[PDB]
Design an enzyme around this catalytic site. Structure first.
Site, mmCIF file in Angstrom:
data_model
loop_
_atom_site.group_PDB
_atom_site.id
_atom_site.type_symbol
_atom_site.label_atom_id
_atom_site.label_comp_id
_atom_site.label_asym_id
_atom_site.label_seq_id
_atom_site.Cartn_x
_atom_site.Cartn_y
_atom_site.Cartn_z
ATOM 1 C CG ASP B 110 -0.200 -0.305 2.505
ATOM 2 O OD1 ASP B 110 -0.758 -0.059 3.594
ATOM 3 O OD2 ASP B 110 0.938 -0.804 2.424
ATOM 4 C CE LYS B 162 -2.975 -2.096 20.400
ATOM 5 N NZ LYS B 162 -3.713 -2.384 19.135
ATOM 6 C CG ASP B 218 -1.528 4.559 4.545
ATOM 7 O OD1 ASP B 218 -2.758 4.365 4.632
ATOM 8 O OD2 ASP B 218 -0.920 5.413 5.221
HETATM 9 N N1 LIG Z 1 0.593 -12.729 1.207
HETATM 10 C C1 LIG Z 1 -0.035 -12.101 2.200
HETATM 11 N N2 LIG Z 1 0.258 -10.843 2.432
HETATM 12 C C2 LIG Z 1 -0.393 -10.245 3.432
HETATM 13 C C3 LIG Z 1 -1.338 -10.931 4.182
HETATM 14 N N3 LIG Z 1 -1.839 -10.094 5.113
HETATM 15 C C4 LIG Z 1 -1.224 -8.916 4.982
HETATM 16 N N4 LIG Z 1 -0.350 -8.990 3.951
HETATM 17 C C5 LIG Z 1 0.477 -7.862 3.567
HETATM 18 O O1 LIG Z 1 0.815 -7.165 4.744
HETATM 19 C C6 LIG Z 1 1.051 -5.784 4.399
HETATM 20 C C7 LIG Z 1 0.394 -4.875 5.436
HETATM 21 O O2 LIG Z 1 -0.983 -5.214 5.563
HETATM 22 P P1 LIG Z 1 -2.078 -4.056 5.388
HETATM 23 O O3 LIG Z 1 -1.449 -2.747 5.155
HETATM 24 O O4 LIG Z 1 -2.976 -3.997 6.722
HETATM 25 O O5 LIG Z 1 -3.000 -4.418 4.132
HETATM 26 P P2 LIG Z 1 -4.133 -5.535 4.027
HETATM 27 O O6 LIG Z 1 -3.424 -6.950 3.992
HETATM 28 O O7 LIG Z 1 -4.858 -5.268 2.774
HETATM 29 O O8 LIG Z 1 -5.094 -5.467 5.298
HETATM 30 P P3 LIG Z 1 -6.165 -4.376 5.752
HETATM 31 O O9 LIG Z 1 -5.811 -3.023 5.108
HETATM 32 O O10 LIG Z 1 -6.200 -4.293 7.222
HETATM 33 O O11 LIG Z 1 -7.600 -4.826 5.243
HETATM 34 C C8 LIG Z 1 0.421 -5.560 3.011
HETATM 35 O O12 LIG Z 1 1.450 -5.384 2.050
HETATM 36 C C9 LIG Z 1 -0.298 -6.879 2.701
HETATM 37 O O13 LIG Z 1 -0.159 -7.179 1.317
HETATM 38 C C10 LIG Z 1 -1.616 -12.258 3.863
HETATM 39 O O14 LIG Z 1 -2.442 -12.889 4.491
HETATM 40 N N5 LIG Z 1 -0.959 -12.843 2.868
#
Ligand SMILES: Nc1nc2c(ncn2[C@@H]2O[C@H](COP(=O)(O)OP(=O)(O)OP(=O)(O)O)[C@@H](O)[C@H]2O)c(=O)[nH]1
Ligand SMILES: Nc1nc2c(ncn2[C@@H]2O[C@H](COP(=O)(O)OP(=O)(O)OP(=O)(O)O)[C@@H](O)[C@H]2O)c(=O)[nH]1
EC number: 2.7.7.13
Lengths: 360, 360
Positions: B110, B162, B218
């Site tokens: 992101d 937090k 982001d």
């Molecule tokens: N492959 C993989 N990557 C993940 C997974 N969960 C999180 N990531 C990665 O972790 C990084 C940080 O997570 P977030 O910024 O919270 O993004 P998100 O996975 O879309 O989750 P939310 O925004 O909370 O809905 C991002 O680059 C995601 O692609 C997963 O289950 N599998």
């Protein structure tokens, strides 16, 4: 006969359930609703039905190609990429359905009754004109096309008048037998069968109206999903009492799948249909609910009138009421209260929802 | 070098756009954000990039493996079957990241910034230790994981926090340099890198910090997506002003694709990113709004702080404002006021919506 269930619609009613799987593959009482209608068609003697697909063709094609050989019938599928509504399926499939001069069956997917196919073909031979509908009389719902009918002849004078019933008291149940001569009247364009063909059909007099015995429900809405589940378990009590589970912690009509599991000191109340693989722990009360495949409901929780979707994990001491729908893999934390929570898939809830909301 | 971009977390935040396509493939400033990441990686000089792909695996890989040949860099894809969080990725691809003793990049799906890859890889060698993170300064550090460091080493004492941590004023910008011994702190079980591995690495004394120089954002939230848009369009004014469109009715920082067409006597305001193929009719005032592909916006409309998804239709005299995000193929009827409306894909709106609300 050759039949046709138009199964391609975006399930925008029943939305979090129909975000993971298509609307016909939503498991309704431990068996998908397309499987209900096509199993009734195979009971009726229809040799051939083809799906009219528009959206999420992958899962529908896979499961239906398996169930093709599951039961002795030739079931193909007509694929559409642009959604042509609920009439454009007729003219897209007119290649094979304009072969013979024999009427074909067109059903909505989202409609569950006990299906009078033979009673309506007996009806359809009498008037001998193009189209037959079956209808159902309920007082309060006016969402569908409300119809105006004759005496035991049955001919439609008028229908599709807007909500303000005023003693009409009949709504069409979305199931038609059409002659192949109206196949040429529809064209390829994105068209709705419910509000384009049927109006001139009604002012021509070619629609006739068989009206239904009882136990009808459209289950496109989640509140209507649970109401139809209540009606379907009532009909199974009047038809197959051995299918409904019966024990000390069972109240009313409960449809437990054999793969499911129910812990002790737990009161699964009336009108509950647990799915294949659910784990209901020790001390849960569940009334009027639908729990789908692999959903774990942990102990001491209380659920009433809510759908619990696939692979959900409901925490301890959770109260869910007032038609709460959870998407796939929704995780409710412990000691939370959900009132009208429409939760989208892949969302963990750590905060109560005391008023009806869409958690997203 | 080797890169590991985590791209399979479900985009639960900024949901109506990620209910159809993955969050790595959503268009940010006319390019997927993952392509910003891997293109600046391929400019900086990594050998290849490992992707951790769980959610919508086939549709993401179907474009990533078609882009790798055009870039000139190799792409491996550590295929996640259970979603292993945001740290279980490099436990899955442990043998791929363990081919040589070498720090590797770890990137988030992101984040968008001027990726300072060479200054980061110069900084990581000087401090010696096992892992380094790229931090950035915020304006108001109210509720986010905030970071308190040292003066010149940047040895971060505590990582995750937090809210009402006011002393910190530094946050993790989602870029990490990681030695392979961090690779043997991990396990195949699902885990998070911000939650558990970075916490004990800040217990150790291995985690080090070095803050960026401007424009980090982001796109996890949709309003964060919109302020990142312009954070990027101000960058494209500062650095490469040839790409930004200019004309008589075009004011401020506008991005227009060559397929995108615009009628006359309209006013495209600042911070607009019209995607490919979009049709802006006469008199349509679009300001601070990203319009994704094939979206038709009919005449006399007004749009401000909005995201229009793929293949939407905005009617005449429609007033859409206040981060109203339309999902894919949402048809907005004429003379309608939308304020706060998050509209789920394949849904037509006939009523105006004055208050912020999710339309399911
Ligand atoms: N492959 C993989 N990557 C993940 C997974 N969960 C999180 N990531 C990665 O972790 C990084 C940080 O997570 P977030 O910024 O919270 O993004 P998100 O996975 O879309 O989750 P939310 O925004 O909370 O809905 C991002 O680059 C995601 O692609 C997963 O289950 N599998
Ligand atoms: N094959 C096919 N079936 C369709 C198409 N459009 C609607 N249908 C069917 O129409 C049937 C009944 O119409 P609706 O009750 O309004 O259901 P829906 O298509 O899910 O539409 P919503 O009003 O958004 O819920 C549904 O079971 C759909 O399968 C289509 O484009 N192709």
């Amino acid at each position: 006969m050759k039949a046709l269930i138009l199964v391609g619609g975006y399930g925008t009613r029943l939305r979090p359930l129909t975000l993971s799987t298509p609307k016909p593959l939503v498991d309704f009482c431990n068996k998908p609703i397309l499987l209900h209608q096509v199993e009734a068609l195979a009971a009726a003697g229809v040799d051939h039905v083809i799906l009219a697909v528009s959206y999420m063709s992958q899962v529908l094609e896979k499961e239906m190609k398996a169930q093709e050989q599951r039961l002795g019938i030739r079931i193909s599928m007509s694929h559409e990429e642009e959604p042509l509504g609920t009439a454009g399926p007729l003219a897209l499939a007119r290649d094979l359905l304009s072969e013979t001069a024999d009427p074909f069956f067109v059903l909505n997917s989202d409609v569950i009754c006990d299906f009078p196919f033979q009673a309506m073909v007996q009806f359809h031979r009498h008037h001998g004109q193009e189209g037959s509908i079956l209808v159902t009389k309920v007082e309060e719902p006016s969402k569908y096309g409300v119809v105006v009918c004759e005496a035991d002849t049955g001919r439609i004078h008028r229908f599709v008048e807007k909500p303000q019933v005023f003693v009409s008291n009949k709504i069409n149940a979305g199931m038609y037998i059409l002659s192949p001569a109206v196949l040429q009247r529809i064209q390829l364009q994105p068209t709705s069968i419910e509000k384009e063909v049927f109006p001139i059909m009604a002012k021509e007099g070619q629609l006739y109206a068989m009206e239904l015995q009882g136990f009808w429900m459209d289950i496109g809405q989640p509140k209507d999903f649970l109401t139809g589940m209540c009606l379907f378990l009532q009909s199974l009590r009047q038809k197959q009492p051995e299918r409904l589970c019966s024990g000390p912690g069972i109240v009313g009509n409960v449809l437990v799948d054999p793969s499911a599991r129910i812990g002790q000191n737990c009161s699964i109340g009336p009108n509950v249909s647990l799915g294949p693989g659910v784990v209901v722990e020790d001390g849960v009360c569940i009334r009027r609910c639908t729990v789908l495949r692999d959903a774990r409901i942990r102990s001491h929780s209380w659920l009433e009138s809510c759908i619990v979707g696939w692979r959900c994990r409901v925490g301890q001491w959770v109260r869910m009421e007032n038609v709460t729908v959870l998407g796939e893999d929704v995780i409710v934390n412990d000691e939370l209260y959900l009132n009208g929570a429409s939760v989208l898939p892949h969302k963990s809830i750590g905060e109560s929802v005391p008023e009806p909301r869409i958690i997203m």
